[PDB]
Design an enzyme around this catalytic site. Structure first.
Site, PDB file in Angstrom:
ATOM      1  N   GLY A  15     -35.813  64.352  60.166  1.00 13.23           N
ATOM      2  CA  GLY A  15     -37.183  64.349  59.670  1.00 13.23           C
ATOM      3  C   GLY A  15     -38.225  64.120  60.750  1.00 13.23           C
ATOM      4  O   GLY A  15     -38.344  64.927  61.679  1.00 13.23           O
ATOM      5  N   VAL A  17     -40.775  60.552  62.629  1.00  2.88           N
ATOM      6  CA  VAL A  17     -41.140  59.139  62.723  1.00  2.88           C
ATOM      7  C   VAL A  17     -42.632  59.077  63.087  1.00  2.88           C
ATOM      8  O   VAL A  17     -43.065  59.703  64.057  1.00  2.88           O
ATOM      9  CB  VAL A  17     -40.238  58.317  63.699  1.00  2.88           C
ATOM     10  CG1 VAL A  17     -40.676  56.853  63.756  1.00  2.88           C
ATOM     11  CG2 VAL A  17     -38.765  58.408  63.306  1.00  2.88           C
ATOM     12  N   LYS A  32     -40.181  56.307  59.099  1.00  2.00           N
ATOM     13  CA  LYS A  32     -39.303  57.468  59.165  1.00  2.00           C
ATOM     14  C   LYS A  32     -39.425  58.204  57.832  1.00  2.00           C
ATOM     15  O   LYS A  32     -39.190  57.608  56.778  1.00  2.00           O
ATOM     16  CB  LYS A  32     -37.845  57.088  59.487  1.00  2.00           C
ATOM     17  CG  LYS A  32     -37.010  58.312  59.838  1.00  2.00           C
ATOM     18  CD  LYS A  32     -35.521  58.046  59.917  1.00  2.00           C
ATOM     19  CE  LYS A  32     -34.813  59.336  60.253  1.00  2.00           C
ATOM     20  NZ  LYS A  32     -33.425  59.367  59.740  1.00  2.00           N
ATOM     21  N   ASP A 114     -24.043  56.440  68.853  1.00  2.00           N
ATOM     22  CA  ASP A 114     -24.946  57.347  69.578  1.00  2.00           C
ATOM     23  C   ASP A 114     -25.857  56.587  70.527  1.00  2.00           C
ATOM     24  O   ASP A 114     -27.063  56.853  70.611  1.00  2.00           O
ATOM     25  CB  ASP A 114     -25.766  58.223  68.614  1.00  2.00           C
ATOM     26  CG  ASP A 114     -26.337  59.479  69.269  1.00  2.00           C
ATOM     27  OD1 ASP A 114     -25.788  59.918  70.317  1.00  2.00           O
ATOM     28  OD2 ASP A 114     -27.304  60.025  68.735  1.00  2.00           O
TER      29      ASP A 114
HETATM   30  C1  LIG Z   1     -33.156  50.560  63.037  1.00  2.00           C
HETATM   31  O1  LIG Z   1     -32.885  51.874  62.538  1.00  2.00           O
HETATM   32  C2  LIG Z   1     -33.777  52.873  62.830  1.00  2.00           C
HETATM   33  C3  LIG Z   1     -34.928  52.725  63.588  1.00  2.00           C
HETATM   34  C4  LIG Z   1     -35.750  53.826  63.821  1.00  2.00           C
HETATM   35  C5  LIG Z   1     -36.976  53.647  64.550  1.00  2.00           C
HETATM   36  C6  LIG Z   1     -37.970  53.477  65.188  1.00  2.00           C
HETATM   37  C7  LIG Z   1     -39.076  53.398  66.026  1.00  2.00           C
HETATM   38  N1  LIG Z   1     -39.889  52.261  66.166  1.00  2.00           N
HETATM   39  N2  LIG Z   1     -40.847  52.404  67.130  1.00  2.00           N
HETATM   40  C8  LIG Z   1     -40.645  53.637  67.611  1.00  2.00           C
HETATM   41  C9  LIG Z   1     -39.550  54.305  66.950  1.00  2.00           C
HETATM   42  C10 LIG Z   1     -39.325  55.638  67.542  1.00  2.00           C
HETATM   43  C11 LIG Z   1     -40.329  55.692  68.658  1.00  2.00           C
HETATM   44  C12 LIG Z   1     -40.553  56.674  69.618  1.00  2.00           C
HETATM   45  C13 LIG Z   1     -41.548  56.500  70.572  1.00  2.00           C
HETATM   46  O2  LIG Z   1     -41.856  57.394  71.564  1.00  2.00           O
HETATM   47  C14 LIG Z   1     -41.136  58.628  71.616  1.00  2.00           C
HETATM   48  C15 LIG Z   1     -42.338  55.330  70.559  1.00  2.00           C
HETATM   49  O3  LIG Z   1     -43.308  55.273  71.528  1.00  2.00           O
HETATM   50  C16 LIG Z   1     -44.207  54.162  71.526  1.00  2.00           C
HETATM   51  C17 LIG Z   1     -42.112  54.355  69.595  1.00  2.00           C
HETATM   52  C18 LIG Z   1     -41.100  54.537  68.654  1.00  2.00           C
HETATM   53  C19 LIG Z   1     -35.401  55.081  63.319  1.00  2.00           C
HETATM   54  C20 LIG Z   1     -34.257  55.225  62.559  1.00  2.00           C
HETATM   55  C21 LIG Z   1     -33.437  54.126  62.306  1.00  2.00           C
HETATM   56  O4  LIG Z   1     -32.295  54.282  61.587  1.00  2.00           O
END
Ligand SMILES: COc1cc(C#Cc2[nH]nc3c2Cc2cc(OC)c(OC)cc2-3)ccc1O
Length: 254
Positions: A15, A17, A32, A114
Site C-alpha cells: 500500500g 505509508v 499505513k 526481512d
Molecule cells: C512496526 O510495524 C510496522 C511499521 C511500519 C512503519 C513505519 C514508519 N514510521 N515512520 C516512518 C515509517 C516509514 C518511513 C519512511 C521514511 O522515509 C522514507 C521516513 O522518513 C522520515 C519515516 C518513516 C510499517 C509497517 C509495519 O508493519
C-alpha cells in the site's frame, strides 16, 4: 475534548505509508494505508524501545489503516554513504540497538525475515527501530519451535540455507541479515547479489579472500565478528548471546 481524533495527512513516506499530524495536539504518526491481518496481529504483540510502536488499527470499508510510531530520522539506508559506509562508532551503536530489537523479537517467538537498512528506521534522537512486519511470522509457540520453509526476504540479505534447504531454523536467518546490515554500515556496499556457490563474491568470502571489497574496507575487529556471523552452516553460525560477548561488540568507541 473535540477534534483530538482528527489527523491531517501531510506527506507520503513510503500500500502506502503517510505522515499524519493531529489537528489538536500536533502529534506526528505514520499511517499505513492498505497478509494484513497477520501484520496487525504480530504488531499487537510488540512493545520494545527498538521496535516501531503500534498504536492501533481501523478498517474503513475495503481500506485498512495502521497507526504507527513516526520515525523522523528516516531509514538507516540513507545514513549509509555508497561505497564508504559510516563512522565505525555509529555503526556499532546502531548494531547494539539492532541486536536489542532482534533479541526482543526472538524472545517472544517472532522472526522479522526481512531485516535490511530500508526497514530499520531512526527516531528524532537517532535511535534505531525495526519496522515493516509484513513478512514477520511466529516461529515459537507454547515453547515449541516451528521450522520454517517459506522463501521470504530480500536476496542480498537472505541466509544461504533459505536457498539450499527445504526447512531451516528461523533465528540464524535473522542473525545473518544483521551481519549483512553490519557489512553495509561499515563498507557502504553489499557483498553479493545472493549467497550461492554460483555467485563469485560469495565463493571468494568462503575462500577467505578478505583483501577484496567490501572486506578490505572493514577493520580487523568488526571483520572478525562478520567471520562468525556470515558462516554458511546455520548450526555453526554465532548466536546473539555469543555476539554480545564478541570483542568488537564490546570495544569502547568514540
Ligand atoms: C512496526 O510495524 C510496522 C511499521 C511500519 C512503519 C513505519 C514508519 N514510521 N515512520 C516512518 C515509517 C516509514 C518511513 C519512511 C521514511 O522515509 C522514507 C521516513 O522518513 C522520515 C519515516 C518513516 C510499517 C509497517 C509495519 O508493519
Amino acid at each position: 475534548v473535540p477534534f483530538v481524533e482528527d489527523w491531517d495527512l501531510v506527506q507520503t513516506l513510503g500500500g502506502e505509508v503517510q505522515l499524519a499530524v493531529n489537528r489538536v495536539t500536533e502529534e506526528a504518526v505514520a499511517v499505513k494505508i492498505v497478509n494484513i491481518k497477520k501484520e496487525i496481529c504480530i504488531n499487537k504483540m510488540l512493545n520494545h524501545e527498538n521496535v516501531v510502536k503500534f498504536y492501533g488499527h481501523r478498517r474503513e470499508g475495503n481500506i485498512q489503516y495502521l497507526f504507527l510510531e513516526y520515525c523522523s530520522g528516516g531509514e538507516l539506508f540513507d545514513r549509509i554513504e555508497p561505497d564508504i559506509g559510516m563512522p565505525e562508532p555509529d555503526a556499532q551503536r546502531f548494531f547494539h540497538q539492532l541486536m536489542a530489537g532482534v533479541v526482543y523479537l526472538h524472545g517472544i517467538g517472532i522472526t522479522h525475515r526481512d531485516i535490511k537498512p530500508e526497514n530499520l528506521l531512526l527516531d528524532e534522537r537517532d535511535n534505531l527501530k525495526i519496522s515493516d512486519f509484513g513478512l514477520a511470522t511466529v516461529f515459537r509457540y507454547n515453547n515449541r519451535e516451528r521450522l520454517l520453509n517459506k522463501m521470504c526476504g530480500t536476496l542480498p540479505y537472505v541466509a544461504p540455507e533459505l536457498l539450499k534447504r527445504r526447512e531451516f531454523h528461523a533465528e540464524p536467518v535473522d542473525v545473518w541479515s544483521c551481519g549483512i546490515v553490519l557489512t553495509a554500515m561499515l563498507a557502504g556496499e553489499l557483498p553479493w547479489d545472493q549467497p550461492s556457490d554460483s555467485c563469485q563474491e560469495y565463493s571468494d568470502w568462503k575462500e577467505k579472500k578478505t583483501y577484496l571489497n567490501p572486506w578490505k574496507k572493514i577493520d580487523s575487529a568488526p571483520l572478525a565478528l562478520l567471520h562468525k556471523i556470515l558462516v554458511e552452516n546455520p548450526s555453526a553460525r554465532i548466536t546473539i548471546p555469543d555476539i554480545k560477548k564478541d570483542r568488537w561488540y564490546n570495544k569502547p568507541l568514540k
